[PDB]
Design a protein around this motif. Structure first.
Motif, PDB file in Angstrom:
ATOM      1  N   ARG A  93     -45.977  38.808 -27.769  1.00 25.35           N
ATOM      2  CA  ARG A  93     -46.238  38.026 -26.566  1.00 25.35           C
ATOM      3  C   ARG A  93     -47.278  38.984 -25.724  1.00 25.35           C
ATOM      4  NH1 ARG A  93     -44.605  35.106 -29.596  1.00 25.35           N
ATOM      5  NH2 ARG A  93     -46.555  34.685 -29.785  1.00 25.35           N
ATOM      6  N   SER A  94     -48.016  38.175 -24.898  1.00 33.58           N
ATOM      7  CA  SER A  94     -49.211  38.907 -24.011  1.00 33.58           C
ATOM      8  C   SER A  94     -48.211  39.431 -22.779  1.00 33.58           C
ATOM      9  CB  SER A  94     -50.144  37.881 -23.544  1.00 33.58           C
ATOM     10  OG  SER A  94     -49.562  36.689 -22.845  1.00 33.58           O
ATOM     11  N   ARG A  95     -48.719  40.502 -22.285  1.00 35.63           N
ATOM     12  CA  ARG A  95     -47.920  41.154 -21.221  1.00 35.63           C
ATOM     13  C   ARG A  95     -48.224  40.613 -19.989  1.00 35.63           C
ATOM     14  NH1 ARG A  95     -48.436  47.211 -18.599  1.00 35.63           N
ATOM     15  NH2 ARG A  95     -46.109  47.720 -18.364  1.00 35.63           N
ATOM     16  N   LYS A  96     -47.292  40.236 -19.058  1.00 37.58           N
ATOM     17  CA  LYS A  96     -47.481  39.634 -17.794  1.00 37.58           C
ATOM     18  C   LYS A  96     -47.170  40.896 -16.799  1.00 37.58           C
ATOM     19  CE  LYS A  96     -49.173  36.548 -17.373  1.00 37.58           C
ATOM     20  NZ  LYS A  96     -48.483  35.225 -17.425  1.00 37.58           N
ATOM     21  N   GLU A  97     -47.892  41.511 -16.328  1.00 37.08           N
ATOM     22  CA  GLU A  97     -47.582  42.615 -15.350  1.00 37.08           C
ATOM     23  C   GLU A  97     -47.108  42.042 -13.908  1.00 37.08           C
ATOM     24  OE1 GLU A  97     -51.204  45.034 -14.656  1.00 37.08           O
ATOM     25  OE2 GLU A  97     -52.401  43.080 -14.320  1.00 37.08           O
ATOM     26  N   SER A  98     -46.481  43.054 -13.239  1.00 30.54           N
ATOM     27  CA  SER A  98     -45.795  42.617 -12.014  1.00 30.54           C
ATOM     28  C   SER A  98     -45.496  43.987 -11.234  1.00 30.54           C
ATOM     29  CB  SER A  98     -44.544  41.674 -12.133  1.00 30.54           C
ATOM     30  OG  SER A  98     -43.498  42.060 -12.556  1.00 30.54           O
ATOM     31  N   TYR A  99     -45.227  43.690  -9.719  1.00 33.16           N
ATOM     32  CA  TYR A  99     -44.870  44.836  -8.905  1.00 33.16           C
ATOM     33  C   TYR A  99     -43.180  45.075  -8.984  1.00 33.16           C
ATOM     34  CZ  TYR A  99     -49.508  44.924  -7.239  1.00 33.16           C
ATOM     35  OH  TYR A  99     -50.952  45.149  -7.332  1.00 33.16           O
ATOM     36  N   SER A 100     -42.656  45.099 -10.239  1.00 35.70           N
ATOM     37  CA  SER A 100     -41.084  44.662 -10.301  1.00 35.70           C
ATOM     38  C   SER A 100     -40.520  45.887  -9.800  1.00 35.70           C
ATOM     39  CB  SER A 100     -40.537  44.439 -11.620  1.00 35.70           C
ATOM     40  OG  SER A 100     -40.962  45.396 -12.630  1.00 35.70           O
ATOM     41  N   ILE A 101     -40.640  47.167 -10.631  1.00 40.71           N
ATOM     42  CA  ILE A 101     -39.728  48.328 -10.290  1.00 40.71           C
ATOM     43  C   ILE A 101     -40.091  49.010  -8.838  1.00 40.71           C
ATOM     44  CG2 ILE A 101     -39.729  48.780 -12.614  1.00 40.71           C
ATOM     45  CD1 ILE A 101     -41.575  51.303 -12.276  1.00 40.71           C
ATOM     46  N   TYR A 102     -41.559  48.638  -8.395  1.00 38.52           N
ATOM     47  CA  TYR A 102     -41.965  49.268  -7.294  1.00 38.52           C
ATOM     48  C   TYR A 102     -41.333  48.644  -6.056  1.00 38.52           C
ATOM     49  CZ  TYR A 102     -45.382  49.989 -10.888  1.00 38.52           C
ATOM     50  OH  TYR A 102     -46.078  50.095 -12.177  1.00 38.52           O
ATOM     51  N   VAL A 103     -41.364  47.180  -6.004  1.00 37.91           N
ATOM     52  CA  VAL A 103     -40.531  46.275  -5.061  1.00 37.91           C
ATOM     53  C   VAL A 103     -39.175  46.834  -4.997  1.00 37.91           C
ATOM     54  CG1 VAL A 103     -40.136  44.039  -4.318  1.00 37.91           C
ATOM     55  CG2 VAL A 103     -42.426  44.788  -4.896  1.00 37.91           C
ATOM     56  N   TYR A 104     -38.547  46.774  -6.201  1.00 36.63           N
ATOM     57  CA  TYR A 104     -36.979  47.266  -6.234  1.00 36.63           C
ATOM     58  C   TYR A 104     -36.874  48.634  -5.653  1.00 36.63           C
ATOM     59  CZ  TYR A 104     -32.451  46.707  -8.040  1.00 36.63           C
ATOM     60  OH  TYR A 104     -31.133  47.103  -8.168  1.00 36.63           O
ATOM     61  N   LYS A 105     -37.682  49.513  -5.995  1.00 36.05           N
ATOM     62  CA  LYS A 105     -37.454  50.909  -5.313  1.00 36.05           C
ATOM     63  C   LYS A 105     -37.746  51.032  -3.729  1.00 36.05           C
ATOM     64  CE  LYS A 105     -39.090  53.378  -9.543  1.00 36.05           C
ATOM     65  NZ  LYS A 105     -40.296  53.764 -10.347  1.00 36.05           N
ATOM     66  N   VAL A 106     -38.828  49.864  -3.448  1.00 37.47           N
ATOM     67  CA  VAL A 106     -38.942  49.741  -2.110  1.00 37.47           C
ATOM     68  C   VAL A 106     -37.611  49.282  -1.241  1.00 37.47           C
ATOM     69  CG1 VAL A 106     -40.127  48.653  -0.164  1.00 37.47           C
ATOM     70  CG2 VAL A 106     -41.256  49.829  -2.093  1.00 37.47           C
ATOM     71  N   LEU A 107     -36.858  48.305  -1.925  1.00 40.27           N
ATOM     72  CA  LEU A 107     -35.798  47.789  -1.432  1.00 40.27           C
ATOM     73  C   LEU A 107     -34.623  48.822  -1.481  1.00 40.27           C
ATOM     74  CD1 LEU A 107     -34.003  45.091  -0.574  1.00 40.27           C
ATOM     75  CD2 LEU A 107     -33.521  44.811  -3.151  1.00 40.27           C
TER      76      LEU A 107
END
Lengths: 91, 103, 533, 99, 105, 94, 104, 83, 98
Positions: free
Chosen positions: F1-15
DNA sequence: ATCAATATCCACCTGCAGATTCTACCAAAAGTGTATTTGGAAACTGCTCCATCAAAAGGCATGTTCAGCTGAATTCAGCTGAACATGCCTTTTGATGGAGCAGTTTCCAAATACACTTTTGGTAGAATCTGCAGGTGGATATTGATG
DNA sequence: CATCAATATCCACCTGCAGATTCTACCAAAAGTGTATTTGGAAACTGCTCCATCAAAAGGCATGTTCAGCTGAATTCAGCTGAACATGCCTTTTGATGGAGCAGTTTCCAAATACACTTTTGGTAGAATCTGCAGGTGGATATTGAT
């Protein structure tokens, strides 16, 4: 140097009142207002005041970005269009 | 000797005025426009150009398309201009492109 | 003394009745009251209109020029102490205009020529160390002993001064006239100056001026030009038309030397003569206005006869020409100028000259070719208008069948199958030798010379005019050119520099009718004195 | 003897028509220019202004005012009134979302 | 030989529109018919707006188009008004409109 | 499948940095991703317009800083400017 | 072997921001410090709204941030509300707000 | 596919009442509901067409969430949580 | 029989629907309406469920804002009951109509 | 002032879809190092055009009076709010054919990248032309007022 | 409700001027054509995810009805605050004019691509454990309306 006639014109501090009563009356008449309360004028003045920092600050932020000291009409044009109030004729 | 150099500071700026005036001759041969009128016309055409180009660029970005063609521009004409204006603009663009291709 | 009071009351009363402009000068200037404690620091003569009245009433004035000087001193003080943007400066200007209107009839009623305060233009000085540069105007300059001057790059001051006009005292009545206004010269009338009023009182007349343009030595070219101009004026029959005298006042044999670049490129190869001989002639046009001779046109020409080696042979070139717009009538003035030039173009083609060259280079702003200090209201023609003027003059010459045709220098070079820079005429002080030297230098940094010559030829084709006076086989069998006019040695016109320098040093300006007449009279006196050795 | 006096509203409607049929600027140039200068110096001192910039700002402010005044007149009429009060302009700005 | 506008029967320069699209950072590649289509749309818009402005001018007994005529042209066309709903016109004024309640009797 | 990037780990680390004991739901996570994407797009477009107006073909920290000043109101803009200035200072200090 | 994000001491990906800026066709050239500054601004905003959402969740006796918490945080901050005045938060609802006139 | 019709009545009166309650409205007049329905229809006519104009451009035959959210964004009604 | 005074249940609903965030418009009727609008716009269309949810919440939020503006206009007219002229005024001031 | 009928708040506990925690891949990023190119720092400078001041004049600031606008008090027709009976239609869980969304290859018409010749648009200066802004004379509703 | 009369103004006409229009010439910046190189996505085929459709059960509001509380709407009338207007002056605008900075020129160096390797690691298929709160239970506690 002499002079002969010179007025101080201490209006700089209270220049918001510099917007004359007939000026606001004419503006309301252009807006179709038939009768004007006495409390509108100064209130509209404040509204006017607000609009200034709504636009000119951005224009100032434009002027500082271009390393200029003079506020240009093109800075004003982008300042107004960035507020959703694009102006024609000053391009 | 050297003359008419004008200090090599001849400020120039591009404008649609002379073209728009020509369009005026197509619609009203005996009607003129003031300097304020031509300035407002230039501002209007520049604003329309910017809006349509931004819409077309965004639409090309949405479909992962790196090339701008007439298809997304006519789509943006449908999106941004109202019904009759959009339809007439689309028809004019289609006729112009067809004539250009056969040219 | 009551006579001058009765004369001068209306003039000052008209000044007083101007309100509210004249109010600030009613009383002595009070610094502390007006809050200007620096008034005495800059102004050295504080006094006002009330002081003027008191002096006019208490037996202080002996003659009206003192009152005129006092009121003009007031004008100068008000102008110097106040910026022109200020109220007082413009009030002073209006009152000065009023006084200039009022005083002239009153001053003339007293037997005086006029009552104006007249000052000359600032006199640009000249450098002494470099012997070639000059002292710039309105710029920092160094001076010593009032005799030696130096520029900033060669007492520290800035040259902003005005030189007033001289005065002459009448021998009979003792009144003082302006030298320019009455046109009195010591050389012409050593007996002394007598005013017109004294002469008319005793029914006498001024002694005939022997130092006149008409009495200058006659020449064939000058006589022919003056005859043509007089015939044209007689044909026109203009009420304001007068008598025009044209005299050839300088004629000397000189040589133009090949510049070092072309000397190395062509002369050293035995393809050019090292120099070209020619005869340079300077003549001036004079007209009688109000019984006074006035110079209104002059030109400098270089003539290379049949003895001159080619390609300069039998060619005339107009190095410089100048005119002053005081000719009467104005409408024929331009035409009169043509009636001069065509006549010259005729005279040379009578001698045997076949080609004429004109450089249509209008003077730059602040620069004068011959006549110093052109009038401020005399517009300097633009290059296009000057070219059209030359084209009209050439067309008028063609219509008389004197000139066969005229062309631009580029078309002339194209028709003359020119293949090298050697075929162009070499004139003294001409633009083309200088631009050829510059092209040679440019080649030094880098048919190339011919290519650059063609590029410059096409670039400046509209500026240079080449006129064919004799064309066809008649130009191939002409007799040798013999000039019947003898040489006229006069160092005062050996180039345009000497006359301009003399005019600048002696304040011989042409900015007004009276000043131009005075300058013409001084020029005539100088020429007549230089003739006798 | 009974000087002519128009009733309240006739001159008002007349000037309504006059100022809706005209396009000339209503704010005087100098006081508005001074106000703009001081508002700008509140953010950056020693600023300079082009004449065209001042004219553009004036046109924009008058246009915003005429639009807002139309909105306030509509709001006042909605309350069975013909005279605007600060509550009308407050409502207009609230609906526009400025406040 | 022939300009792109002339080949497409256009008045606005196709080349200038193409250059502005290239310099406007709208896409990394630009199609050939894109400037032609954009120029045609712009020409239609200017043609209609100047036609309406001339109509307003001739209704106002005027032969020169002024900003007042442009404002009348845009505002009396509800489609143009929707197009320029967030655009204010320099020296254009407003339409003559008086409220019913403010009217006398 | 085509990769759909996001800010997942960065927002989780900020949290985790700001709230170690507080989590986020999936829908709220999508809202935060949309918010950061929208802010990125707005600032980038404003900077592009700024560069176009001044005839500049390069986007540097100054243009995006001015765009943030135009868009972010008051204290938010001041804090963002200070934090970004510190970030670029440390970036250029190495 | 130091990442450009850790080089500036940031949590947001500087490289990803730079790549998105390049792909966004905002300009033909992008400066080196522009992605760093943009990442810092985005992470500061993320910290601000996340902290406010966590505070709102704690006020609701909740330790998991839900869309309602995000709406409460965004609408209770004047500057943040102005930032998203034209933005609808999914599943966020509206602030509890009743004016006095409707109240008994 | 079946040509659906008269689906504006699916926005029931209690639904509009609930929407008003969320909007802080205490009392509802009888003519409100239908009027709101029409406004709602207009709103849909404002968005769906644009999304359809997006869907037609992508050579797709289904309306996706990205088309909807991007049409809302171009209408100045940006929505979060849907991409 | 126990009966509440008018407005008490309305205000109870005011808190109830200003506290919770679930959708208040039924899913199936709104999906049918969206299908009708799409069919009127273009034949043979399909819809993703997430697109339906996005459209539904967008319309719900827009109507909530419109109802708030309408209520503000209603009290501005010294009233407690909203009427269609209030919605017309709100839309006109917003610039959506004129 | 007290009291009964309801909705509200809230502690608690259970089942679970959603949130959180390891293992392994890996390709799309992410990072470092030369060769290359270039937008722009920096200094000197010509030239706009922006700050400043005085007169002409075109309105702007104040006091009066009251017709009319706004606002307070009263009443009521009815409409919408509250409550309830009936039930329907939406909601939830489950399954399924298949239209259609999307990944991979190929490769050509369309795009880009200069080189070059062609022409075309932007600006300066002259001089003729002209639409229109006011100015003067009736004079046309019109509205306030008289009757 | 019909009409003397002061007044603002549309129009019938005018006439002078700032601005629009016409024409000639110059010239750098586009612009079209040509030739070589590069590639974006069309078609061609096919794997696969979710979109649409059908089925069944049930209860939560959807729909309809009934009773009446109070609220918009209508009416009346009074305090009064702005509209119209006369009076005084004074703030504005424009023309003229020093110099603070906006751009044009030239150098060149710190800085941003192009691109080929080399390494980190953010999605992410998969399975297992942890966990916050959906939802139902039950009883303490404001809330409300009128007993």
């Amino acid at each position: 140097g002499k002079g002969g006639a010179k007025r101080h014109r201490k209006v700089l501090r209270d220049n918001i009142q510099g917007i004359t009563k007939p000026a606001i009356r004419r503006l309301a008449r252009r807006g179709g207002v038939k009768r004007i309360s006495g409390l509108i004028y100064e209130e509209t003045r404040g509204v006017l005041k607000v609009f200034l920092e709504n636009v000119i600050r951005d224009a100032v932020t434009y002027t500082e970005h271009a390393k200029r000291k003079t506020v240009t009409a093109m800075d004003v044009v982008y300042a107004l269009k960035r507020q959703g109030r694009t102006l024609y004729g000053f391009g | 000797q050297k003359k008419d150099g004008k200090k090599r500071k001849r400020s120039r700026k591009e404008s649609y005025s002379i073209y728009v005036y020509k369009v005026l001759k197509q619609v009203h041969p005996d009607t003129g426009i003031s300097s304020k009128a031509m300035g407002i016309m230039n501002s209007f055409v520049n604003d329309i150009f910017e809006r349509i180009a931004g819409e077309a660029s965004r639409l090309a970005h949405y479909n992962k398309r790196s090339t701008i063609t007439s298809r997304e521009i006519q789509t943006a004409v449908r999106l941004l201009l109202p019904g009759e204006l959009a339809k007439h603009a689309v028809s004019e663009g289609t006729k112009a492109v067809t004539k250009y291709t056969s040219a | 003394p009551e006579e001058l009071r009765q004369a001068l009351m209306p003039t000052l009363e008209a000044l007083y009745r101007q309100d509210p402009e004249s109010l600030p000068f009613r009383q002595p200037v009070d610094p502390q009251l007006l809050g200007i404690p620096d008034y005495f620091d800059i102004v050295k003569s504080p006094m006002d209109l009330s002081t003027i009245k008191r002096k006019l009433d208490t037996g202080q004035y002996q003659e009206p020029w003192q009152y005129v000087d006092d009121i003009w001193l007031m004008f100068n003080n008000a102008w110097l102490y106040n910026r022109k943007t200020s109220r007082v400066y413009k009030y002073c200007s209006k009152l000065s205009e009023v006084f200039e209107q009022e005083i002239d009839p009153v001053m003339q009623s007293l037997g005086y020529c006029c009552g104006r305060k007249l000052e000359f233009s600032p006199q640009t000085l000249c450098c002494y160390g470099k012997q070639l540069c000059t002292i710039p105007r309105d710029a920092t300059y160094y001076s010593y002993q009032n005799r030696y001057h130096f520029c900033e790059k060669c007492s520290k001051r800035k040259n902003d001064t005005l030189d007033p006009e001289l005065f002459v005292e009448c021998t009979e009545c003792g009144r003082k006239m302006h030298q320019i206004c009455v046109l009195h010269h010591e050389i012409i009338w050593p007996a002394g100056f007598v005013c017109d009023g004294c002469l008319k009182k005793s029914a006498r007349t001024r002694k005939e001026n022997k130092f006149s343009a008409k009495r200058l030595p006659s020449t064939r070219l000058g006589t022919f030009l003056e005859n043509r101009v007089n015939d044209f004026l007689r044909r026109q029959n203009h009420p304001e038309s007068g008598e025009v005298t044209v005299r050839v006042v300088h004629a000397s044999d000189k040589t133009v030397e090949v510049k070092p670049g072309m000397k190395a490129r062509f002369v050293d190869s035995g393809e050019m003569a090292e120099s070209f001989p020619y005869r340079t002639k300077a003549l001036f046009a004079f007209e009688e206005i109000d019984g006074v001779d006035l110079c209104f046109f002059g030109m400098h020409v270089q003539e290379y006869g049949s003895d001159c080696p080619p390609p300069n042979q039998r060619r005339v070139y107009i190095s410089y020409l100048d005119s002053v717009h005081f000719f009467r009538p104005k409408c024929l003035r331009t035409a009169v100028y043509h009636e001069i030039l065509i006549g010259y173009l005729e005279y040379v083609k009578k001698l045997g000259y076949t080609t004429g060259h004109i450089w249509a280079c209008p003077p730059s702003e602040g620069d004068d070719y011959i006549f110093h200090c052109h009038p401020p209201d005399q517009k300097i023609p633009k290059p296009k208008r000057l070219q059209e003027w030359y084209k009209k003059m050439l067309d008028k010459a063609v219509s008389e069948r004197i000139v066969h045709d005229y062309k631009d220098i580029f078309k002339q070079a194209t028709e003359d199958r020119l293949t090298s820079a050697k075929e162009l005429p070499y004139f003294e002080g001409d633009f083309w030798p200088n631009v050829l030297e510059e092209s040679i230098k440019e080649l030094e940094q880098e048919n190339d010379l011919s290519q650059k010559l063609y590029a410059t030829m096409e670039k400046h084709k509209e500026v240079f005019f080449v006129i064919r006076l004799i064309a066809g086989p008649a130009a191939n069998s002409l007799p040798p050119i013999v000039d019947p006019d003898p040489l006229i040695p006069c160092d005062l016109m050996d180039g345009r520099d000497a006359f301009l320098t003399l005019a600048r040093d002696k304040h011989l300006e042409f900015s007004s009718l009276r000043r131009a007449q005075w300058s013409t009279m001084c020029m005539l006196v100088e020429l007549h004195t230089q003739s006798q050795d | 003897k009974k000087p002519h006096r128009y009733r309240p509203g006739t001159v008002a409607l007349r000037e309504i028509r006059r100022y809706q049929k005209s396009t000339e600027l209503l704010i005087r140039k100098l006081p508005f220019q001074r106000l703009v200068r001081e508002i700008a110096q509140d953010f950056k001192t020693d600023l300079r202004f082009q004449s065209s910039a001042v004219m553009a700002l004036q046109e924009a402010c008058e246009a915003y005012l005429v639009g807002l005044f139309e909105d306030t007149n509509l709001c006042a009429i909605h309350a069975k009134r013909v005279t605007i009060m600060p509550k009308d302009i407050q409502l207009a700005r609230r609906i526009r979302g400025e406040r | 030989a022939k300009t792109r506008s002339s080949r497409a029967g256009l008045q606005f320069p196709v080349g200038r529109v193409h250059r502005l699209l290239r310099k406007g950072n709208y896409s990394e590649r630009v199609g050939a018919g894109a400037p032609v289509y954009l120029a045609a749309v712009l020409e239609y818009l200017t043609a209609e707006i100047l036609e309406l402005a001339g109509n307003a001018a001739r209704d106002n007994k005027k032969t020169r188009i002024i900003p007042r005529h442009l404002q009348l042209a845009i505002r009396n066309d509800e489609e143009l008004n929707k197009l320029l709903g967030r655009v204010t016109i320099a020296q254009g004024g407003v339409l003559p409109n008086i409220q019913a309640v403010l009217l006398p009797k």
